[PDB]
PDB file of C-alpha atoms and ligand atoms in Angstrom:
ATOM      1  CA  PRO G  31       0.002  -0.002  -0.002  1.00 49.48           C
ATOM      2  CA  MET G  32       1.309   3.397  -1.007  1.00 50.96           C
ATOM      3  CA  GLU G  33       2.791   5.332   1.949  1.00 51.59           C
ATOM      4  CA  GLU G  34       1.810   9.020   2.557  1.00 52.34           C
ATOM      5  CA  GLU G  35       4.260  11.496   4.116  1.00 53.62           C
ATOM      6  CA  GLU G  36       3.685  15.136   5.006  1.00 53.08           C
ATOM      7  CA  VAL G  37       6.337  17.743   4.122  1.00 52.37           C
ATOM      8  CA  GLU G  38       6.528  21.374   5.303  1.00 50.53           C
ATOM      9  CA  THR G  39       8.618  23.965   3.381  1.00 54.23           C
ATOM     10  CA  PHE G  40       9.918  27.059   5.169  1.00 52.00           C
ATOM     11  CA  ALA G  41      11.676  30.225   3.969  1.00 50.70           C
ATOM     12  CA  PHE G  42      14.931  31.157   5.628  1.00 50.77           C
ATOM     13  CA  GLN G  43      14.869  34.477   7.436  1.00 49.25           C
ATOM     14  CA  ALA G  44      16.048  37.061   4.903  1.00 52.87           C
ATOM     15  CA  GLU G  45      19.557  37.762   6.269  1.00 53.32           C
ATOM     16  CA  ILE G  46      20.205  34.051   6.926  1.00 53.05           C
ATOM     17  CA  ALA G  47      19.371  33.476   3.234  1.00 55.39           C
ATOM     18  CA  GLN G  48      21.744  36.342   2.225  1.00 50.23           C
ATOM     19  CA  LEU G  49      24.505  34.772   4.415  1.00 48.17           C
ATOM     20  CA  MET G  50      24.024  31.329   2.857  1.00 48.21           C
ATOM     21  CA  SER G  51      24.323  32.862  -0.639  1.00 49.14           C
ATOM     22  CA  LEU G  52      27.510  34.725   0.434  1.00 46.79           C
ATOM     23  CA  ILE G  53      28.976  31.479   1.859  1.00 45.66           C
ATOM     24  CA  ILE G  54      28.108  29.447  -1.276  1.00 49.79           C
ATOM     25  CA  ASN G  55      28.991  31.935  -3.989  1.00 49.75           C
ATOM     26  CA  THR G  56      32.270  33.387  -2.656  1.00 49.79           C
ATOM     27  CA  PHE G  57      35.664  31.727  -2.549  1.00 50.84           C
ATOM     28  CA  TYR G  58      36.987  31.180   1.013  1.00 48.88           C
ATOM     29  CA  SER G  59      40.234  29.569   2.030  1.00 52.18           C
ATOM     30  CA  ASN G  60      40.214  27.799   5.388  1.00 50.39           C
ATOM     31  CA  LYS G  61      36.934  25.927   4.692  1.00 52.16           C
ATOM     32  CA  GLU G  62      38.018  23.129   7.057  1.00 50.19           C
ATOM     33  CA  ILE G  63      36.598  25.101  10.047  1.00 47.20           C
ATOM     34  CA  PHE G  64      33.137  23.750   9.159  1.00 48.34           C
ATOM     35  CA  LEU G  65      33.977  20.596  11.126  1.00 47.62           C
ATOM     36  CA  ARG G  66      34.974  22.620  14.239  1.00 44.64           C
ATOM     37  CA  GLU G  67      31.627  24.439  14.043  1.00 46.83           C
ATOM     38  CA  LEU G  68      29.584  21.206  13.840  1.00 46.06           C
ATOM     39  CA  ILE G  69      31.558  19.477  16.604  1.00 47.53           C
ATOM     40  CA  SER G  70      31.080  22.623  18.777  1.00 49.08           C
ATOM     41  CA  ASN G  71      27.309  22.341  18.271  1.00 48.97           C
ATOM     42  CA  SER G  72      27.402  18.655  19.256  1.00 47.66           C
ATOM     43  CA  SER G  73      29.465  19.496  22.387  1.00 46.47           C
ATOM     44  CA  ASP G  74      26.888  22.146  23.390  1.00 46.22           C
ATOM     45  CA  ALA G  75      24.046  19.653  22.870  1.00 47.61           C
ATOM     46  CA  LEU G  76      25.905  17.021  24.987  1.00 47.01           C
ATOM     47  CA  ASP G  77      26.306  19.570  27.755  1.00 43.21           C
ATOM     48  CA  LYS G  78      22.547  20.213  27.649  1.00 47.11           C
ATOM     49  CA  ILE G  79      21.509  16.579  28.092  1.00 46.33           C
ATOM     50  CA  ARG G  80      24.197  15.998  30.675  1.00 47.26           C
ATOM     51  CA  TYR G  81      22.844  18.831  32.880  1.00 43.58           C
ATOM     52  CA  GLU G  82      19.144  18.041  32.245  1.00 45.38           C
ATOM     53  CA  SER G  83      19.914  14.437  33.343  1.00 47.18           C
ATOM     54  CA  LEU G  84      21.070  15.721  36.752  1.00 44.11           C
ATOM     55  CA  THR G  85      17.523  17.041  37.409  1.00 47.52           C
ATOM     56  CA  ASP G  86      15.920  13.957  35.861  1.00 47.70           C
ATOM     57  CA  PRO G  87      17.985  10.755  35.302  1.00 48.47           C
ATOM     58  CA  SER G  88      15.204   9.175  33.192  1.00 48.46           C
ATOM     59  CA  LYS G  89      16.283  11.616  30.451  1.00 45.04           C
ATOM     60  CA  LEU G  90      19.086   9.123  29.762  1.00 47.45           C
ATOM     61  CA  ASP G  91      16.658   6.212  29.150  1.00 46.19           C
ATOM     62  CA  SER G  92      17.085   7.123  25.468  1.00 46.20           C
ATOM     63  CA  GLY G  93      20.765   6.360  25.972  1.00 47.19           C
ATOM     64  CA  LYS G  94      23.426   6.888  28.662  1.00 49.16           C
ATOM     65  CA  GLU G  95      26.523   7.362  26.460  1.00 48.39           C
ATOM     66  CA  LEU G  96      27.514  10.972  25.617  1.00 53.02           C
ATOM     67  CA  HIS G  97      29.722  11.046  22.496  1.00 52.75           C
ATOM     68  CA  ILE G  98      30.345  12.166  18.934  1.00 52.35           C
ATOM     69  CA  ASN G  99      30.846   9.895  15.871  1.00 53.32           C
ATOM     70  CA  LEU G 100      32.230  11.012  12.499  1.00 53.04           C
ATOM     71  CA  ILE G 101      31.281   8.845   9.527  1.00 49.36           C
ATOM     72  CA  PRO G 102      32.781   9.514   6.063  1.00 49.23           C
ATOM     73  CA  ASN G 103      31.153   7.552   3.194  1.00 49.82           C
ATOM     74  CA  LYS G 104      33.126   7.593  -0.041  1.00 46.59           C
ATOM     75  CA  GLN G 105      30.367   5.779  -1.933  1.00 46.51           C
ATOM     76  CA  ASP G 106      27.644   8.363  -1.466  1.00 44.49           C
ATOM     77  CA  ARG G 107      30.120  11.260  -0.860  1.00 46.10           C
ATOM     78  CA  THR G 108      28.687  12.212   2.555  1.00 47.36           C
ATOM     79  CA  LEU G 109      30.316  13.098   5.874  1.00 45.50           C
ATOM     80  CA  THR G 110      28.012  12.593   8.847  1.00 47.07           C
ATOM     81  CA  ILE G 111      28.562  14.090  12.327  1.00 43.92           C
ATOM     82  CA  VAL G 112      26.438  12.197  14.931  1.00 43.61           C
ATOM     83  CA  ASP G 113      25.962  13.096  18.575  1.00 46.51           C
ATOM     84  CA  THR G 114      23.959  11.710  21.477  1.00 44.57           C
ATOM     85  CA  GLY G 115      23.114  15.226  22.749  1.00 44.90           C
ATOM     86  CA  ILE G 116      19.798  16.735  23.673  1.00 45.92           C
ATOM     87  CA  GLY G 117      18.413  16.722  20.082  1.00 46.32           C
ATOM     88  CA  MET G 118      15.818  19.189  18.734  1.00 45.26           C
ATOM     89  CA  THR G 119      12.049  19.118  18.882  1.00 42.50           C
ATOM     90  CA  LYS G 120      10.205  20.084  15.701  1.00 39.83           C
ATOM     91  CA  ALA G 121       9.794  23.677  16.969  1.00 37.94           C
ATOM     92  CA  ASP G 122      13.490  23.786  17.893  1.00 37.26           C
ATOM     93  CA  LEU G 123      14.360  22.680  14.355  1.00 36.89           C
ATOM     94  CA  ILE G 124      12.263  25.201  12.601  1.00 38.64           C
ATOM     95  CA  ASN G 125      13.183  28.116  14.900  1.00 36.28           C
ATOM     96  CA  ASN G 126      16.920  27.485  15.409  1.00 37.98           C
ATOM     97  CA  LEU G 127      17.886  26.242  11.929  1.00 37.66           C
ATOM     98  CA  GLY G 128      16.565  29.051   9.807  1.00 37.20           C
ATOM     99  CA  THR G 129      13.356  30.939  10.610  1.00 39.22           C
ATOM    100  CA  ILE G 130      14.339  33.211  13.521  1.00 40.17           C
ATOM    101  CA  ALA G 131      16.758  36.115  12.957  1.00 41.74           C
ATOM    102  CA  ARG G 132      20.299  35.882  14.426  1.00 40.58           C
ATOM    103  CA  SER G 133      21.494  39.200  15.904  1.00 41.30           C
ATOM    104  CA  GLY G 134      25.009  38.612  14.573  1.00 41.90           C
ATOM    105  CA  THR G 135      24.191  37.875  10.890  1.00 43.14           C
ATOM    106  CA  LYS G 136      24.469  41.443   9.577  1.00 40.36           C
ATOM    107  CA  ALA G 137      27.675  42.147  11.508  1.00 39.91           C
ATOM    108  CA  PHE G 138      29.207  38.944  10.182  1.00 40.80           C
ATOM    109  CA  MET G 139      28.347  39.705   6.552  1.00 41.06           C
ATOM    110  CA  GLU G 140      29.927  43.161   6.979  1.00 43.22           C
ATOM    111  CA  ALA G 141      33.076  41.503   8.480  1.00 40.06           C
ATOM    112  CA  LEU G 142      33.318  39.071   5.580  1.00 39.34           C
ATOM    113  CA  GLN G 143      32.837  41.844   3.007  1.00 40.75           C
ATOM    114  CA  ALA G 144      35.787  43.635   4.706  1.00 41.24           C
ATOM    115  CA  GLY G 145      38.012  40.512   4.322  1.00 41.19           C
ATOM    116  CA  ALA G 146      37.526  38.564   7.554  1.00 37.31           C
ATOM    117  CA  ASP G 147      38.550  34.908   7.617  1.00 35.53           C
ATOM    118  CA  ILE G 148      35.514  32.598   7.447  1.00 37.29           C
ATOM    119  CA  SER G 149      36.774  31.061  10.764  1.00 35.69           C
ATOM    120  CA  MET G 150      35.183  34.076  12.457  1.00 37.86           C
ATOM    121  CA  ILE G 151      31.658  32.709  11.718  1.00 40.33           C
ATOM    122  CA  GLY G 152      31.119  30.846  15.027  1.00 38.03           C
ATOM    123  CA  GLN G 153      31.718  33.995  17.053  1.00 36.83           C
ATOM    124  CA  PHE G 154      28.675  35.501  15.280  1.00 35.16           C
ATOM    125  CA  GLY G 155      26.141  32.856  16.340  1.00 34.05           C
ATOM    126  CA  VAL G 156      25.765  31.421  12.796  1.00 34.66           C
ATOM    127  CA  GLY G 157      28.369  28.624  12.824  1.00 32.16           C
ATOM    128  CA  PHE G 158      25.957  25.913  11.489  1.00 31.45           C
ATOM    129  CA  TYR G 159      25.915  27.624   8.022  1.00 30.43           C
ATOM    130  CA  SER G 160      29.634  26.916   7.599  1.00 28.47           C
ATOM    131  CA  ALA G 161      28.411  23.433   6.462  1.00 29.65           C
ATOM    132  CA  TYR G 162      27.623  25.104   3.060  1.00 29.65           C
ATOM    133  CA  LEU G 163      31.371  25.887   2.521  1.00 29.90           C
ATOM    134  CA  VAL G 164      31.793  22.148   1.737  1.00 31.13           C
ATOM    135  CA  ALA G 165      28.242  20.693   1.249  1.00 33.86           C
ATOM    136  CA  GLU G 166      25.821  21.285  -1.622  1.00 30.57           C
ATOM    137  CA  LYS G 167      22.956  19.857   0.535  1.00 34.62           C
ATOM    138  CA  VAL G 168      22.685  19.297   4.283  1.00 37.63           C
ATOM    139  CA  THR G 169      20.288  16.933   6.022  1.00 35.74           C
ATOM    140  CA  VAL G 170      19.779  17.083   9.743  1.00 35.39           C
ATOM    141  CA  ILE G 171      18.089  14.103  11.496  1.00 35.35           C
ATOM    142  CA  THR G 172      17.241  14.733  15.124  1.00 34.34           C
ATOM    143  CA  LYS G 173      15.467  13.134  18.054  1.00 36.90           C
ATOM    144  CA  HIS G 174      14.694  14.911  21.330  1.00 37.93           C
ATOM    145  CA  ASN G 175      13.135  13.149  24.363  1.00 34.81           C
ATOM    146  CA  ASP G 176      10.014  15.332  24.042  1.00 36.90           C
ATOM    147  CA  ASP G 177       9.162  14.374  20.496  1.00 38.16           C
ATOM    148  CA  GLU G 178       9.402  12.227  17.334  1.00 39.16           C
ATOM    149  CA  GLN G 179      12.395  11.948  14.991  1.00 40.04           C
ATOM    150  CA  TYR G 180      12.516  14.689  12.306  1.00 43.10           C
ATOM    151  CA  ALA G 181      14.506  15.380   9.191  1.00 40.82           C
ATOM    152  CA  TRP G 182      15.434  18.924   8.116  1.00 38.33           C
ATOM    153  CA  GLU G 183      17.029  19.451   4.726  1.00 40.09           C
ATOM    154  CA  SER G 184      18.208  22.246   2.489  1.00 41.83           C
ATOM    155  CA  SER G 185      20.142  22.849  -0.650  1.00 44.36           C
ATOM    156  CA  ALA G 186      20.064  26.588   0.039  1.00 42.77           C
ATOM    157  CA  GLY G 187      18.342  28.739  -2.564  1.00 43.74           C
ATOM    158  CA  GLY G 188      16.130  30.269   0.205  1.00 44.51           C
ATOM    159  CA  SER G 189      14.122  27.301   1.544  1.00 44.94           C
ATOM    160  CA  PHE G 190      14.359  24.283   3.806  1.00 44.72           C
ATOM    161  CA  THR G 191      11.967  21.322   4.492  1.00 48.25           C
ATOM    162  CA  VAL G 192      10.936  19.492   7.645  1.00 50.27           C
ATOM    163  CA  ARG G 193       9.331  16.052   7.804  1.00 49.83           C
ATOM    164  CA  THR G 194       8.831  13.267  10.280  1.00 49.75           C
ATOM    165  CA  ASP G 195      11.787  10.918   9.625  1.00 50.75           C
ATOM    166  CA  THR G 196      10.820   7.356   8.529  1.00 51.66           C
ATOM    167  CA  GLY G 197      14.488   6.245   8.410  1.00 53.25           C
ATOM    168  CA  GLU G 198      16.493   4.283  11.030  1.00 53.40           C
ATOM    169  CA  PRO G 199      15.515   5.301  14.623  1.00 56.05           C
ATOM    170  CA  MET G 200      18.074   7.168  16.764  1.00 57.51           C
ATOM    171  CA  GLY G 201      17.555   6.938  20.531  1.00 58.04           C
ATOM    172  CA  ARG G 202      18.322  10.664  21.072  1.00 56.61           C
ATOM    173  CA  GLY G 203      20.610  13.195  19.438  1.00 60.38           C
ATOM    174  CA  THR G 204      21.378  14.799  16.109  1.00 61.89           C
ATOM    175  CA  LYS G 205      23.013  13.631  12.877  1.00 63.38           C
ATOM    176  CA  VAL G 206      24.220  16.230  10.392  1.00 62.68           C
ATOM    177  CA  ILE G 207      24.722  14.669   6.944  1.00 63.93           C
ATOM    178  CA  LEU G 208      26.891  16.731   4.593  1.00 62.04           C
ATOM    179  CA  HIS G 209      26.414  15.910   0.893  1.00 61.53           C
ATOM    180  CA  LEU G 210      29.844  17.155  -0.171  1.00 60.68           C
ATOM    181  CA  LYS G 211      30.510  19.277  -3.243  1.00 61.84           C
ATOM    182  CA  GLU G 212      32.617  17.495  -5.913  1.00 64.74           C
ATOM    183  CA  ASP G 213      35.778  19.539  -5.139  1.00 61.51           C
ATOM    184  CA  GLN G 214      35.522  18.976  -1.367  1.00 62.23           C
ATOM    185  CA  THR G 215      36.021  15.222  -1.200  1.00 63.43           C
ATOM    186  CA  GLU G 216      39.245  15.636   0.857  1.00 66.01           C
ATOM    187  CA  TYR G 217      36.911  15.646   3.918  1.00 66.07           C
ATOM    188  CA  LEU G 218      36.138  11.962   3.370  1.00 66.48           C
ATOM    189  CA  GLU G 219      39.817  11.035   3.902  1.00 68.98           C
ATOM    190  CA  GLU G 220      40.720   9.636   7.343  1.00 67.94           C
ATOM    191  CA  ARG G 221      44.049  11.495   7.454  1.00 68.88           C
ATOM    192  CA  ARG G 222      42.435  14.831   6.642  1.00 68.97           C
ATOM    193  CA  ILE G 223      39.645  14.390   9.194  1.00 65.72           C
ATOM    194  CA  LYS G 224      42.161  13.439  11.885  1.00 70.85           C
ATOM    195  CA  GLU G 225      44.301  16.449  11.000  1.00 72.14           C
ATOM    196  CA  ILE G 226      41.458  18.975  11.345  1.00 68.37           C
ATOM    197  CA  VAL G 227      40.077  17.426  14.571  1.00 67.97           C
ATOM    198  CA  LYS G 228      43.574  17.661  16.125  1.00 69.11           C
ATOM    199  CA  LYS G 229      44.076  21.264  14.879  1.00 63.60           C
ATOM    200  CA  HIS G 230      40.665  22.742  15.783  1.00 64.45           C
ATOM    201  CA  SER G 231      38.701  20.419  18.130  1.00 64.97           C
ATOM    202  CA  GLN G 232      41.185  19.180  20.687  1.00 66.70           C
ATOM    203  CA  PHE G 233      39.518  20.430  23.908  1.00 68.10           C
ATOM    204  CA  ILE G 234      36.079  19.005  23.474  1.00 71.14           C
ATOM    205  CA  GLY G 235      34.860  17.271  26.606  1.00 68.83           C
ATOM    206  CA  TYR G 236      33.247  14.123  25.109  1.00 67.03           C
ATOM    207  CA  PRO G 237      34.818  11.213  23.225  1.00 67.76           C
ATOM    208  CA  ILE G 238      34.884  11.388  19.454  1.00 68.03           C
ATOM    209  CA  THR G 239      35.293   8.377  17.221  1.00 65.85           C
ATOM    210  CA  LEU G 240      36.028   8.231  13.480  1.00 65.90           C
ATOM    211  CA  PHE G 241      34.476   5.247  11.673  1.00 66.08           C
ATOM    212  CA  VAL G 242      36.303   4.248   8.463  1.00 67.20           C
ATOM    213  CA  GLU G 243      34.847   1.781   5.958  1.00 63.00           C
ATOM    214  CA  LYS G 244      37.432  -0.887   5.151  1.00 62.28           C
ATOM    215  CA  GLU G 245      38.836   0.104   1.707  1.00 63.73           C
TER     216      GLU G 245
HETATM  217  N1  ADP J 301      24.050  19.012  17.079  1.00 62.98           N
HETATM  218  C1  ADP J 301      23.031  19.855  17.530  1.00 62.98           C
HETATM  219  N2  ADP J 301      22.219  19.400  18.513  1.00 62.98           N
HETATM  220  C2  ADP J 301      21.232  20.237  19.001  1.00 62.98           C
HETATM  221  N3  ADP J 301      20.967  21.470  18.499  1.00 62.98           N
HETATM  222  C3  ADP J 301      21.791  21.947  17.526  1.00 62.98           C
HETATM  223  C4  ADP J 301      22.809  21.091  16.883  1.00 62.98           C
HETATM  224  N4  ADP J 301      23.418  21.880  15.985  1.00 62.98           N
HETATM  225  C5  ADP J 301      22.794  23.101  15.922  1.00 62.98           C
HETATM  226  N5  ADP J 301      21.827  23.090  16.811  1.00 62.98           N
HETATM  227  C6  ADP J 301      20.845  24.193  17.155  1.00 62.98           C
HETATM  228  O1  ADP J 301      21.058  25.136  16.125  1.00 62.98           O
HETATM  229  C7  ADP J 301      21.430  26.429  16.710  1.00 62.98           C
HETATM  230  C8  ADP J 301      22.294  27.177  15.708  1.00 62.98           C
HETATM  231  O2  ADP J 301      23.662  26.637  15.686  1.00 62.98           O
HETATM  232  P1  ADP J 301      24.825  27.668  15.236  1.00 62.98           P
HETATM  233  O3  ADP J 301      24.464  28.314  14.002  1.00 62.98           O
HETATM  234  O4  ADP J 301      26.111  26.891  15.320  1.00 62.98           O
HETATM  235  O5  ADP J 301      24.695  28.824  16.324  1.00 62.98           O
HETATM  236  P2  ADP J 301      25.182  28.759  17.911  1.00 62.98           P
HETATM  237  O6  ADP J 301      25.964  27.409  18.117  1.00 62.98           O
HETATM  238  O7  ADP J 301      26.090  29.951  18.084  1.00 62.98           O
HETATM  239  O8  ADP J 301      23.889  28.882  18.656  1.00 62.98           O
HETATM  240  C9  ADP J 301      22.087  26.049  18.000  1.00 62.98           C
HETATM  241  O9  ADP J 301      21.958  27.155  18.939  1.00 62.98           O
HETATM  242  C10 ADP J 301      21.182  24.935  18.436  1.00 62.98           C
HETATM  243  O10 ADP J 301      19.929  25.386  18.996  1.00 62.98           O
HETATM  244 MG1   MG J 302      27.404  26.770  16.837  1.00 62.32          MG
END
């Protein structure tokens, strides 16, 4: 019997859409900082569930281990960053990943126009959008204790979608799936991933593991 799935399409807030266009259509060196930004997000989400669990230990029923996994896939050209952090409810996903204005967005675009390094993006409260330095499409799968599993996705161009995820269940957390641009396949290489984790993400307070498919 044919399955039926609901999709909701949302417009990015106008300056977030302008920032995404600037990130995609301008050459930047130092693109590797995308991974620092996504690991930082995971670390923040791990902190949240860790503290929430102090008030309410049953919040870890959906899984006690607090960690980050990095999964390059050379066959489908994706790099996935998975955490067991707090996750996002549907409302969190729509509000925090594109609809609500970020106070730093205009300042950051001015800084970039004046020649700032793209590394400065996290300081402006818009670090997630660094994924578009290396990815043509991003899919975020997330599960929060309060709610069902959802999938957010965008290829930029001004819009994103949200749907209930019918894929593999996660117990709790977020997976960011980067569909890499053709010229950015270095970020599937185990040596390159280890290099940029060591350079930029050395003080994060949860274990990170890199899973490499046997060649
Ligand atoms: N791995 C994650 N788990 C939970 N929420 C996340 C994740 N990544 C991003 N988010 C949500 O998206 C928001 C935007 O992230 P970002 O653009 O990096 O800004 P910032 O980290 O400065 O808030 C975060 O504040 C958070 O609410
Ligand atoms: Mg961030």
